[PDB]
Design a protein around this ligand. Structure first.
Ligand SMILES: CNC(=O)c1cc(C2CC2)cc([N+](=O)[O-])c1N[C@@H]1CCCC[C@@H]1NC(=O)c1cc(=O)[nH]c2ccccc12
Ligand SMILES: CNC(=O)c1cc(C2CC2)cc([N+](=O)[O-])c1N[C@@H]1CCCC[C@@H]1NC(=O)c1cc(=O)[nH]c2ccccc12
Lengths: 301, 302
């Protein structure tokens, strides 16, 4: 028993991280097959980032302007292209540690593991969630760009995130592995603000089902409510409105515990309107919302 | 910026995880060079765990009775031996994915990453700390035995923990890679208590420094305190007494933020007496004690 913020093993992703240098700028790259993926702003200087013309800057670059290295050995760039905000560097050698992989664009509320890297070497792994405002609460320093987020399905590595920038609020924005930014953010060094963030309601409920499955049940009351009554109280606390799909996703967790979903919302509505009164759930004095329903089942069984 | 409970990269440890089966019991093993390390209770049935005689049970076992499987390759056992509470199975070939490694016994209050494994396959990685009562608050199910905890200095893996059992209170206990249990626990399925736990004080202060590094500074007050006055508050709230060694180890973090150590103790002293007043520190409503001073510096400098 027990419940930890658990991240996927990072072994299959470690074998793909390289170091990409263009001029004086260095970041991390993703070496899949004979292509290296990296944030396109690697071709920009500090003065370029204030208003970059990526199409004009990239065309003035040749294959020898990029220094790619996996560990110590070098990789010869034989071609370069751009796809949205991700640079694609063609190399002469295919990565012998390329795993079965996919490029997915996840939805807000989904979770993934992050492998924080610097200069092509991993620094640590942790679990993240795509916030409703299309940001992530990560742990990134200078040189962390190019780090990727991922999930593991059996033997397949689903790449869903590539790190690009830190907003002034301390949160982080990035793209999928096709270059399309999550949210309305751009890769320009101009003032950008993440929208009003909300709480992933279906993840809070799944975390409450995890506490029951682990024996924490002091919060279960004896009342019930409706989706209309709950969402009315949910909106005042900046909680995402609960839809019927969310009720269905909580289905399997409700079956194993024998606690109805609308019953669990009433306990949450009471936990919101009355606070936690200093008590703890699964070792937390707040309401945790970075566990999807699928993560709860995958960890408890 | 930001601050997450970050675990070490687990690639080097993944290549050493194999499956060990003895009859119907299956658990995980650590394959380093030509030796597979696993908990010795894999040789026990459910009836033997009530009062096992491991020497007698091991004598009735032969090399071919140990089924060691590494993914899809089946390893050939050429010998077996017992060291304390771990079984050492010598296999046919040396593990080609063996990293540079060491066997270390960690102290209470220190941290490490756990690679949870089932049937020899890695399931996930998370960071945790050895509690002062020599237990860990982990996440383990049936079949998780054999999973290991580790640290990475540079390229060398410091194995420090191997999982063995879950206690009645829901916490977990295990041994080092030499078979010596952390704590007063024996590998027999009879009631065992972990004893009273405490809160790792130096870790909380290091976490407070991590909050100031990341722009979280509302808890800084206009008060200071002495080492003795702080420990009176600490013993009241079941915190480990702060020593001079703890003050010295916090030096580097005190220099990076400009906050004196005794000033930070004053801010922690106020938080212990008054609470948080409905606010958060690094996204937490509790005082976190699973970050050592070295964990903060490693994460905040990369
Ligand atoms: C610090 N500001 C930014 O990171 C940033 C901000 C904006 C807009 C809000 C103004 C836009 C971009 N942009 O368009 O790329 C930004 N990206 C810069 C410029 C390009 C090259 C990567 C670099 N970022 C980092 O190296 C970095 C990433 C991170 O997660 N955390 C850090 C912590 C400490 C120092 C640096 C970073
Ligand atoms: C549940 N009790 C124990 O785990 C346990 C307790 C004691 C004493 C305090 C009473 C001693 C041992 N022992 O000597 O091995 C124990 N170990 C058992 C018996 C041997 C074979 C491994 C097995 N462990 C697990 O399958 C298991 C490990 C875990 O982390 N969490 C689980 C969650 C749910 C069900 C099982 C487990």
């Amino acid at each position: 028993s027990g419940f930890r913020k658990m991240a996927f093993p990072s072994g299959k992703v470690e074998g793909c991280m390289v170091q990409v240098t263009c001029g004086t700028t260095t970041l991390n790259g993703l070496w899949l097959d004979d292509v290296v993926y990296c944030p396109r702003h690697v071709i920009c200087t500090s003065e370029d980032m204030l208003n970059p013309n990526y199409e004009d800057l990239l065309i003035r670059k040749s294959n020898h302007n990029f220094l790619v290295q996996a560990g110590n050995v070098q990789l010869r760039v034989i071609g370069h292209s751009m796809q949205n905000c991700v640079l694609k560097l063609k190399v002469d050698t295919a990565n012998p540690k390329t795993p079965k992989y996919k490029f997915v664009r996840i939805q807000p509320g989904q979770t993934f593991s992050v492998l924080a890297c610097y200069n092509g070497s991993p620094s640590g792994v942790y679990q993240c969630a795509m916030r409703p405002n299309f940001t992530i609460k990560g742990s990134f320093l200078n040189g962390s760009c190019g780090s990727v987020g991922f999930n593991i399905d059996y033997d397949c590595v689903s790449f869903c995130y590539m790190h690009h920038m830190e907003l002034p609020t301390g949160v982080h924005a990035g793209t999928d592995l096709e270059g399309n930014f999550y949210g309305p953010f751009v890769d320009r060094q101009t003032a950008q603000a993440a929208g009003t963030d909300t709480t992933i309601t279906v993840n809070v409920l799944a975390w409450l089902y995890a506490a029951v499955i682990n024996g924490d049940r002091w919060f279960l009351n004896r009342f019930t409510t409706t989706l209309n009554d709950f969402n009315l109280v949910a909106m005042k606390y900046n909680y995402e409105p609960l839809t019927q799909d969310h009720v269905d996703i909580l289905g399997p967790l409700s079956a194993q515990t024998g606690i109805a979903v609308l019953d669990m919302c009433a306990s949450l509505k009471e936990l919101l309107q009355n606070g936690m009164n200093g008590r703890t759930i699964l070792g937390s004095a707040l309401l945790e919302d970075e566990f999807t329903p699928f993560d709860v089942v995958r960890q408890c069984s």
